[PDB]
Design a protein around this ligand. Structure first.
Ligand SMILES: CC(C)(COP(=O)(O)OP(=O)(O)OC[C@H]1O[C@@H](n2cnc3c(N)ncnc32)[C@H](O)[C@@H]1OP(=O)(O)O)[C@@H](O)C(=O)NCCC(=O)NCCS
Ligand SMILES: CC(C)(COP(=O)(O)OP(=O)(O)OC[C@H]1O[C@@H](n2cnc3c(N)ncnc32)[C@H](O)[C@@H]1OP(=O)(O)O)[C@@H](O)C(=O)NCCC(=O)NCCS
Lengths: 180, 179
């Protein structure tokens, strides 16, 4: 299958994206699902799709949050039935090329830990904040490790973001060579 | 000088807010300044202002970003001629109370360093990241210290956010006692 820029004018494709988002995150994409999809189609954003034949199996987007330099990776979803076969890796790498081409320097993201997937949850993060970040361990195949393998680093945490001891984990990667 | 809920239907107050935002952050607030002000009026957000008889002297807002438990403090501004008189402190204190009333647990913010205002800028933040964060110093009266004095702690940094060696500094505070 191929990874390419998402055709913002393809009703069918946009429908599959909506479903994929609703299925994956039913609590986050219930009503305004097709609506948030349109939000992801914004010209200022980047929208990359993974299509097998004619089926959308993965999608990744990026939002410019700091001028043209800092972008937020959001969202990233791969059909639960097509995971573990480099689709996510290929989507992230394609996104990075697209961001760089627009003058982007860094991409960051927030990956939450709501069900004790890592050692950063179920603990007071204001205590030994960064020692805990540095010694993080993946307890339940939390996706933060997916990003680490792609070169992203945990650069921060948001204590009790989603409720007591259910933090958001901030990760980032600078995608181009540093002026030398 | 009464710090209270911002009147979201007052067009004149909104124009002053728009003005204050363009004077404080001319790079972030330009032609579409009125639009950005309307976004701050969204029903889910908290909007609080310090008003002296008729002049808008300060404004603070908050956005629920994680359910209703995690809120981003944005924006916060006090007229230059009125600073260092506790108006900022009072705006934040008032906001924290209102956020808590709405179910908030944590308030966070991102304060950028674009002009070597702290030791975190003008250096490759990917080398000894947390060592540098741990020994941060305030070089040009950067506002991160204002938040630190109010109980906020640096919980993260985004290297090269605004361009090489011009990071964003993430700070946060849990506003209610831990059960
Ligand atoms: C996380 C996700 C996007 C990864 O997509 P994918 O196509 O399955 O990932 P890939 O096959 O490209 O994985 C590449 C590498 O990352 C690792 N990896 C992937 N998901 C992982 C996880 N949850 N925990 C640990 N490692 C993981 C793989 O083992 C592989 O490592 P290896 O090369 O050493 O074997 C996908 O599983 C998904 O859709 N998850 C749910 C959505 C989500 O929570 N996203 C996080 C955004 S906040
Ligand atoms: C940052 C700002 C809101 C502070 O408002 P303020 O009314 O001047 O703050 P206060 O007078 O309540 O300050 C309380 C304490 O913080 C300190 N403080 C305030 N601004 C500070 C700064 N920039 N650097 C260091 N300390 C600062 C005060 O000295 C005082 O300390 P003390 O209690 O030890 O005497 C104001 O300067 C402002 O509007 N700045 C421009 C916009 C901005 O940068 N906003 C921050 C968003 S990231």
């Amino acid at each position: 299958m191929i990874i390419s820029e998402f055709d913002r004018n393809n009703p069918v494709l946009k429908d599959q994206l909506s479903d994929l988002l609703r299925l994956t995150w039913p609590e986050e994409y219930g009503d305004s699902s097709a609506e948030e999809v349109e939000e992801m189609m914004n010209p200022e954003r980047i929208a990359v799709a993974a299509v097998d034949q004619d089926e959308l199996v993965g999608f990744i987007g990026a939002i410019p949050q700091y001028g043209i330099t800092g972008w937020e990776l959001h969202p990233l979803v791969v059909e639960s039935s097509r995971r573990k076969n480099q689709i996510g890796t290929r989507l992230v790498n394609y996104l990075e090329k697209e961001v760089a081409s627009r003058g982007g320097i860094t991409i960051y993201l927030g990956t939450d830990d709501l069900d004790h997937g890592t050692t950063l949850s179920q603990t007071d993060l204001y205590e030994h904040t960064f020692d805990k970040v540095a010694s993080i361990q993946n307890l339940r195949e939390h996706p933060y490790e997916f990003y680490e393998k792609l070169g992203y680093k945990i650069v921060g945490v948001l204590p009790n973001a989603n409720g007591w001891d259910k933090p958001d984990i901030w990760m980032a990667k600078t995608i181009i060579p540093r002026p030398d």
